[PDB]
Design a protein around this ligand. Structure first.
Ligand SMILES: NC(=O)C1=CN([C@@H]2O[C@H](COP(=O)(O)OP(=O)(O)OC[C@H]3O[C@@H](n4cnc5c(N)ncnc54)[C@H](OP(=O)(O)O)[C@@H]3O)[C@@H](O)[C@H]2O)C=CC1
Ligand SMILES: NC(=O)C1=CN([C@@H]2O[C@H](COP(=O)(O)OP(=O)(O)OC[C@H]3O[C@@H](n4cnc5c(N)ncnc54)[C@H](OP(=O)(O)O)[C@@H]3O)[C@@H](O)[C@H]2O)C=CC1
Ligand SMILES: NC(=O)C1=CN([C@@H]2O[C@H](COP(=O)(O)OP(=O)(O)OC[C@H]3O[C@@H](n4cnc5c(N)ncnc54)[C@H](OP(=O)(O)O)[C@@H]3O)[C@@H](O)[C@H]2O)C=CC1
Ligand SMILES: O=C(O)CCC(=O)C(=O)O
Ligand SMILES: O=C(O)CCC(=O)C(=O)O
Ligand SMILES: O=C(O)CCC(=O)C(=O)O
Lengths: 459, 459, 459
């Protein structure tokens, strides 16, 4: 070996491997242990220096990455993250998860992830442009419409996708679906901005219907959300549309929580959206209307929302990895939370997951908190990216209604697959909800493992 | 010149050329003689050494080929054959036929064929993997989704397609529709396994309806099939579904014939399918149930089925070229056979064809045996390969019902084209069935010849 | 950031940076601090999975790497290491050093390094072949005669270069100087096998002449060598040719030391060379003649040679990084060692270097132990690799005498450059030997930094 310490990647791997072991999978297919050893080493990783010029004319250096983890099911597919935390460990955890998430969409997409330790905060739009130009000058050699199709993630919006696309087209002299999250007039898809957040809510709708035998829905439920970017914004919007209340949003500096009964409104979400476009914090808008209304809003510096929202019915962590601790998980259970789905990749700590899963095993039916992993619940974004690829390959643009209908079908099938797979391989006690994390992991892994075997990646 | 002796290719060429001469085609378009001279020389042929390692660690050498015969109508398209007989002559006959077959599908596909003298019999799956890896290491330079799209044929199943695809993706670093016959989760098409055999039966349904003025169908007919691989299996299944009886299957070592009235069943076909997956002979399963039941089954070592089935209504040779001799053709006529369609490429000897065509000319209406050439009747496989390409380019997967409906329409149009073209250019005597071989040949040739002229390949 | 822990890389970086700071370089050119920040992040790194088949038919997985550190002065250039320790940290230290080493040769070569955690020990030649085939199947995309030219290093001999070259030629369909260390009939260079070890000895000849005002040479000196592979073998041979005594060799399991006065002979070195070709340990040949002669040889299991050789005049660590500890450095000083040059990359620990450099500063003239860094002393290998590239580009083969003459000139110029640069930028006290480590580091760094500035890599 001897291998570097990659805690985030190791966490993701261990949770997958644990769920596979705690099932009948390896009794039925013990040869899949070999598949697991092979799939866990990325097919290819590219790391590269990115030199770029700041607004003062000074040289700056950052590190760029693209992890091309697995391509059995399709070209590598997954986002780009621009955040100062970024390193290979983080991108490997993300790319690894992406393989199995993509498998659950039913579309032909392999798994990858990339990005940079470039921090968009405090940069001008001009600085972001120059950075994206330099970044893509190297990345374009390694990607392409039938090769690897990136998109956004934390710190990468349609703005950055644009600058990246422009430079790709300039060097490669091809106009194609090399990126998704593109602008509406230059190959974007309707519903792509909404897709991840909408999908998370669609998925939880199925969880609620199943756990409650159709007796409950989002109507009248209180939903605590974290983050305030793309996933959080549209998850919030969909909750509101379905008659639920959104009782929190947050960012890296603090939480903005509804004080009492009430909800964010669509108009408030749009103000927050514009603030985040400008790369400003929630803290910067709580001094003026509407967010200075202390009757409606409480801003809590340095906090996550989970312990401050009081009673809640659904939690949708939608910011970043490891944002629900073991202690926070218990608080949510004590607050009456019965549904927790990850908008963020690896949003729950392992302690949180263990807490939720023990609770499910101990409490029959609708008394349990039911946990859905990000690879199932947040797959709507990448699914609609696949549809953007489909549109670009067709050279046509579909309607909002057409894309949204497909998104709904994909989320329904993903839920059913996880539910039915857990019922088959990890059969719960009578009256106990099946494990959606175990089911989703087995369903995604087996699809990839079998395609790998067919293609001679292992034998 | 001076040109090598290529008997199979010369046979295919001479039969095409003869049908074109025995028509009014060259009275109307004498310049098409030039097209015939040009189209008959392949655009490109690649031959290459394939070195591979056996399970004992020893070097082995085989010969690889890809004949890229014509691309006027589309990228080169056709299968790969792994059989010890393979040489350039055989692959040229196959690739030549493929040009005109592909033309009759209505899809944009040129004609090609390839393969190796590698013999899968007696090899382990590991040996087949290593062979496919080495084979594609060279072939990948020459093929691609808009260039040349291979598939299976004799000795190449989904297993080999998988190993080939994996190695292509590894070297070329593109995930695309470079092969067809792919697995369901990695870009395959529903109905592709069924397509060739289903199509042959769909085509003969039209022949029966026409010859009998709608009075007869497959219902109650006895159907003698040869081979026991992909084409034979699904032709048998479709016959059974339509209420016909399948009275024979065969392989290279002997024939397995129904003893009396009766049929293979779907369950028996599946047992035979699994035996052939394991590369075992029919001879190896006749010692145990159900095939050891001598009341139902008679295994005849060294024989073809045609003279041993007694009375039959339809014959579908579905194994290999030149598998119905002139004497066998007469026996089938004496046995009451009224429909003969080639599942196999060039399944009938020239003596057989001449016998069938003389019989058609001598016997009005439904009294004639009606012969359909492989380029018409077996075109369903390549047609569904075209639809697999279409699906891969759309980045979506169609339903079984959608693919099957298109397959039915393609086979209907192919029949109508051959029938109507023969009625126009080779008008039969009153009451005599038109020549489907002449009609199909003229219809395919003229479409290619005219596209070639448009593209400046001849003038 | 936040960056992974890469101790080997950090060690190499810190030693370079320290020598640059302890000089007048940044007084004269403070802008070179920017160059240092840019040059220290590799231009590109490729990591890739390598799946290969063992002699039992089982799947095995290893990790492959190529670090393409800097290309200002030429295409990336440096070896491949196959050793179970390999990881990115180790390859970054090696590739970083390579940039500056290559700069000192005077040839147009950038810096890189690659390899795998594949362990050649215990593998058959067939297993090594299959591994190299799989390795190059991915690596060939990233390298080429004007792009990146690998070669051997630990665990990669002409045998592996051959298997790698064969697979490159098969996929890329170009015969070119993509690798060095090639075989004599297929583009190799005479003197390349000898070059590294010969060069180390040539370099030390200059050190001895300078320190002793021409009064001493290798004639009559006792030379302790570590390792027993390519560098150690030919360093030993050259010492013997010059009338010196080689008093030790070693491998990863122990040291083989001359017992008393005496030397390894060329015939003994050839026996050891054949043992290492077979990937066997020194321990396996000490039970038979000649090495079982306890009067001449003492095998010491688990030891390095430095404390067991008694009095010595020159030490040439030629095995691996960090193989002379601080305590061993003091023992060598106490044993009368006056010259220490690294055959191995980063052979001395930082404690050893500090000890040697303090001794030089404290002891005038020939009383000092004089330390030469690997980037100066071991540059003969890569220099002759450059000449192999030159020969391949000329399409001609030079004589042994021609290559060796150029090698001698390159080593002389490298010594003079390090000596003169230290005299200019880090002027020692009267009578004190200039620092060859400081001089070599400044000379290599400034050449790269200035070329980078010219090319717009920093400003
Ligand atoms: N966009 C998509 O389609 C997909 C995204 N995801 C995942 O959803 C999550 C959110 O992504 P997305 O909305 O697109 O990204 P955005 O950059 O639009 O928003 C990220 C939000 O999370 C906060 N955040 C980011 N890093 C941290 C951190 N280290 N600590 C605390 N808060 C943090 C951000 O606050 P601040 O501005 O203060 O840093 C911001 O409010 C991620 O886990 C992402 O991988 C899941 C599938 C699809
Ligand atoms: N698969 C497809 O989509 C297409 C195939 N075809 C043609 O259909 C025919 C059958 O192909 P397919 O079913 O796919 O192939 P398979 O390899 O699946 O089956 C071939 C069958 O034919 C037998 N066979 C092969 N060679 C000989 C031979 N020299 N002598 C006697 N019997 C032989 C085989 O027996 P054994 O195992 O003992 O050798 C086996 O039963 C061929 O002519 C093919 O070119 C037509 C269009 C499409
Ligand atoms: N070959 C070249 O042209 C160049 C090589 N170098 C450097 O010279 C040194 C030797 O390389 P080279 O002779 O080519 O390689 P070889 O593989 O031919 O020999 C390496 C020697 O060092 C021993 N060795 C390797 N790793 C260790 C270890 N972790 N611990 C203890 N002993 C070890 C080996 O013993 P064992 O077999 O028991 O592992 C063997 O005797 C390396 O530092 C290399 O990077 C410098 C410039 C050029
Ligand atoms: O659309 C994509 O490719 C990626 C969406 C995303 O960021 C994710 O799945 O984590
Ligand atoms: O699907 C294909 O490309 C080929 C099918 C086939 O083997 C044939 O038409 O002969
Ligand atoms: O010849 C080469 O490219 C490399 C020689 C080597 O292993 C080194 O300089 O460390």
């Amino acid at each position: 070996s001897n291998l570097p310490h990659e805690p985030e990647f190791e966490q993701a791997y261990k949770e997958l491997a644990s769920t596979l072991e705690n099932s009948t999978l390896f009794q039925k297919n013990p040869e899949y242990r070999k598949a697991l050893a092979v799939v866990s080493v990325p097919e290819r990783v590219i790391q590269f220096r990115v030199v770029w010029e700041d607004d003062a004319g000074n040289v700056q250096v950052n590190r760029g990455f693209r992890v091309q983890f697995n391509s059995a099911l399709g070209p590598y597919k997954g986002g780009l993250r621009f955040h100062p935390s970024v390193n290979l460990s983080i991108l490997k955890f993300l790319g690894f998860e992406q393989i199995f998430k993509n498998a659950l969409t039913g579309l032909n997409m392999g798994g990858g992830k990339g990005g940079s330790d470039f921090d968009p905060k405090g940069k001008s739009d001009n600085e972001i442009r120059r950075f994206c130009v330099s970044f893509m000058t190297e990345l374009c050699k390694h990607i392409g419409a039938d090769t690897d199709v990136p998109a956004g993630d934390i710190g990468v919006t349609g703005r950055e996708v644009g600058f990246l696309f422009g430079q790709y087209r300039k060097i490669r002299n091809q106009w194609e679906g090399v990126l998704t999250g593109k602008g509406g007039s230059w190959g974007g898809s309707l519903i792509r901005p909404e897709a991840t957040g909408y999908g998370v809510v669609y998925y939880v709708e199925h969880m609620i219907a199943h756990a409650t035998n159709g007796q409950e829905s989002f109507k009248g439920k209180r939903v605590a959300i974290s983050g305030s970017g793309n996933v959080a914004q549209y998850a919030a919007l969909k909750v509101i549309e379905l008659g639920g209340s959104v009782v929190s949003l947050s960012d890296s500096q603090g939480s903005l929580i509804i004080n009492g009964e009430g909800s964010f409104t669509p108009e408030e979400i749009e103000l927050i959206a514009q603030t985040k476009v400008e790369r400003k914090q929630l803290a910067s808008i709580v001094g003026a209307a509407p967010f200075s209304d202390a009757n409606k809003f409480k801003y809590i510096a340095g906090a996550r929302p989970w312990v401050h929202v009081g009673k809640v019915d659904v939690a949708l962590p939608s910011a970043t990895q490891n944002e629900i601790s073991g202690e926070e998980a218990q608080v949510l259970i004590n607050a009456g939370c019965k549904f927790i789905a990850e908008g963020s990749n690896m949003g729950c700590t392992q302690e949180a997951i263990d807490t939720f899963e023990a609770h499910r095993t101990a409490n029959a039916g609708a008394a349990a908190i039911w946990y859905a992993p990000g690879k199932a619940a947040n797959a709507g974004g990448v699914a609609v990216s696949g549809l953007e690829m489909a549109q670009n390959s067709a050279r046509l643009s579909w309607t909002s209604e057409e894309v949204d209908a497909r998104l709904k079908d994909i989320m329904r099938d993903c839920f059913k697959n996880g539910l039915e797979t857990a019922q088959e391989y990890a059969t719960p006690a009578e009256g106990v909800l099946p494990s959606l994390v175990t089911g989703s992991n087995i369903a995604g892994f087996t699809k990839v493992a079998a395609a790998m075997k067919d293609q001679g990646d292992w034998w």
